[PDB]
Every structure is written in C-alpha cells, then in structure tokens.
Amino acid sequence: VEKNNLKVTSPDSIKGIYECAIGNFGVPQYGGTLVGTVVYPKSNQKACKSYSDFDISFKSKPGRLPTFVLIDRGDCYFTLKAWIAQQAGAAAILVADSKAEPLITMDTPDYLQNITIPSALITKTLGDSIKSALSGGDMVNMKLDWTESVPHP
C-alpha cells in the first residue's frame, strides 16, 4: 500500500500527522505539497451521482483554500467518485473507508488519463475524527505531502 503523509493543521484538537493511501488514478503534485480545507457534503456523500443536480460546487473562492472533499466509500467505483468530484471543482478527494481496517489501495476498474484530481483513501478512524470536527463547527485544514513520493513509470 503506497502511502503519503497527511498533516491536519486545524482544529488544534486533531492536529497532527496521519497516513493516507494514494489511489491508482489522479495526479499528486509529486515532490510538492497541497494545502486545502476539508468539506463533507450533506448530500451525495458517496459521490456516485452528479453534484451539479444538487447545485453543489467545491470550487473555492479566490484567496480561500482549495477544497478537499471527504467522500464515503461504497456503491460505485473509486475512479467514478474522483471523476465526479473533479467535475464539481474539488482540488482533491479523500475517500473515507467504510470499515475500520488497514489502508487499502484504490484501484481502477485512455479515460484514466482524464482523472487528475489527487485521490487518496483514509481510514474510517481518521474520517470519523474529521467528521466530528466539522460537526462541531470547526474548519478542518490539511496539507497533503508528496515531497518524497516518487511515481511509477
């Protein structure tokens, strides 16, 4: 399981370094990092359907942090969740595992080349911690670290 470090920068309650598992699609900024804010939509939480019907966009306003969308595993292909979040303007997708278990690699089921959004899966533990912080009205900000992540050919 190929992993990279993830750093929650806020709120203070859950700040720290965690691991995430990089999916076999999307394009991390290898050698670099990406800071964003995490959002867990109230609707279409598995990103199996189009966000446009919901009039939901994750395009962040100028000067604000890029939006990372927290998405639940289940019901559809991981690649489709990425494609759909990408269409909705998300800067990255974090797929929270539906069961508590070691990290797994999100595999693909040409068109894979069209998926560019950094895509990673996080544990149910971390997913639930983030949801709790957001539920308390806290912004959850996060730095994705690929500084030492080297891609395969």
Side-chain angles (χ1 to χ4, degrees), residues 51-104:
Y51 282 103
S52 54
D53 294 311
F54 291 98
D55 199 35
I56 293 179
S57 169
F58 305 112
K59 300 170 194 293
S60 61
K61 297 194 298 91
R64 304 199 61 111
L65 284 177
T67 301
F68 298 169
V69 61
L70 185 58
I71 286 169
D72 293 317
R73 180 188 187 185
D75 294 5
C76 61
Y77 288 133
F78 293 126
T79 46
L80 180 73
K81 300 173 185 277
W83 176 250
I84 285 173
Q86 176 171 306
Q87 297 319 294
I93 178 186
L94 303 168
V95 174
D97 207 343
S98 56
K99 44 192 165 186
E101 66 179 354
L103 289 170
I104 60 170

Side-chain angles (χ1 to χ4, degrees), residues 7-11 33-39 57-69 88-92 134 138-144:
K7 189 190 287 83
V8 176
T9 62
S10 73
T33 68
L34 181 60
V35 179
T37 192
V38 177
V39 173
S57 169
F58 305 112
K59 300 170 194 293
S60 61
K61 297 194 298 91
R64 304 199 61 111
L65 284 177
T67 301
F68 298 169
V69 61
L134 296 173
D138 294 331
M139 183 175 293
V140 173
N141 297 321
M142 175 185 297
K143 178 179 172 179
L144 299 175

Side-chain angles (χ1 to χ4, degrees), residues 1-14:
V1 186
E2 300 175 354
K3 307 181 209 73
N4 64 276
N5 287 346
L6 173 163
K7 189 190 287 83
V8 176
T9 62
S10 73
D12 189 17
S13 56
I14 60 171

